[PDB]
Design a protein around this ligand. Structure first.
Ligand SMILES: Nc1ncnc2c1ncn2[C@@H]1O[C@H](COP(=O)(O)OP(=O)(O)O)[C@H]1CO
Ligand SMILES: Nc1ncnc2c1ncn2[C@@H]1O[C@H](COP(=O)(O)OP(=O)(O)O)[C@H]1CO
Ligand SMILES: [Mg+2]
Ligand SMILES: [Mg+2]
Ligand SMILES: [Mg+2]
Ligand SMILES: [Mg+2]
Lengths: 191, 191
């Protein structure tokens, strides 16, 4: 099976192609952050919208949400969202899904296929929001480092986030708890 | 709350201090790999040992299993396992747990405390094994890159892994599925 190799190979997939970064980011670091953000958003959403989400499936979906970029590489959204490329890249992403996991036990094989082809719309939407939050946070850290080239990136991500908070109250709550002073200049928790 | 800041601050915590690495590894990359390994080990263990594990708690424990290293930094095991430092570092790790998460909702606060102070012994043991597997895998990748300085590291980690496979059949199965040709020289799945 290639599955363990793929998990480590995600470190070789860079994000933010074409932008100067003070800190280079790979898909594994991004996915770690998306898992944690997805968990936090889930807890907030459960309490506000009065429900219980299946966190096993949510966390596993977040964990593997970008695993196909080991084949496609990471195509930045200004490129992937172009009308010329939008549908073909989703079709390509779908082709990678249907091919990735071959030499496994049916316990793993079925469970891996279930995760990749997940049709739980709410879990997909939570991870999509977590994905946007993480992109915003990265842009905040770069700006904080002094990277003027991410100012316009932070602004458009922040504008899209603001609009999402008007429609998803759990995102507004997340914004209020964490995204108003981010990152922290004083990491008091270290001392 | 410092929780979101801490999630990103784990990128500033390096592993393998005092060893030459061709690729520098941080706690976020390591934790991503441990989450995925913990999931795979859990599926194998469930099938072999005839049970169902609560994967929500397992994955969340793996996710945060090294979060206290944002305060302690990452102390390598030859140092932390010295008889002089063994108990004090665990006491220190415990002090960090009881202090980390302050300004949260009780939904988050209680859930975060539950995860950190988890007393499910089996979940702790799965993550401990995943942690050893990840260390072995890192050592395999470095050796594969040509890093002769990790040969003796790979050997001792491999020896400890071999002994663990004699006592935990799900680890032997994992070894048979993934750890016999690792990493792959031919990443055929990319093409
Ligand atoms: N303004 C931007 N300029 C350049 N790259 C960007 C920008 N915004 C995002 N990226 C990169 O595309 C990746 C994912 O972005 P996203 O998740 O926020 O957008 P969607 O794919 O969800 O539409 C992100 C890092 O490479
Ligand atoms: N032989 C070694 N030489 C130097 N550093 C090591 C070695 N083995 C492990 N490390 C580093 O200690 C970290 C964790 O190791 P571990 O998880 O396998 O050992 P335990 O803490 O579980 O006893 C690891 C990377 O920094
Ligand atoms: Mg996105
Ligand atoms: Mg993503
Ligand atoms: Mg360990
Ligand atoms: Mg660890």
């Amino acid at each position: 099976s290639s599955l363990l190799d793929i998990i480590y190979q995600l470190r070789q997939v860079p994000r933010w192609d074409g932008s100067f970064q003070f800190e280079k980011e790979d898909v594994s670091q991004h996915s770690f952050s998306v898992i944690a953000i997805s968990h936090i958003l889930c807890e907030l959403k459960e309490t506000l919208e009065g429900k219980k989400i299946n966190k096993e499936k949510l966390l596993l979906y977040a964990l593997y949400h970008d695993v196909t970029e080991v084949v496609s590489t990471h195509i930045i959204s200004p490129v992937k969202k172009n009308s010329i490329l939008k549908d073909p890249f989703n079709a390509f992403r779908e082709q990678i899904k249907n091919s990735l996991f071959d030499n496994l036990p049916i316990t793993l094989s079925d469970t891996l296929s279930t995760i990749l082809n997940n049709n739980d719309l709410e879990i997909q939407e939570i991870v999509e929001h977590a994905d946007h939050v993480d992109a915003y946070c990265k842009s905040c850290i770069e700006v904080h480092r002094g990277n003027k080239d991410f100012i316009s990136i932070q602004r458009s991500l922040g504008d899209k986030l603001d609009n999402l908070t008007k429609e998803y109250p759990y995102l507004k709550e997340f914004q209020n708890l964490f995204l108003k002073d981010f990152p922290l200049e004083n990491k008091n928790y270290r001392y």
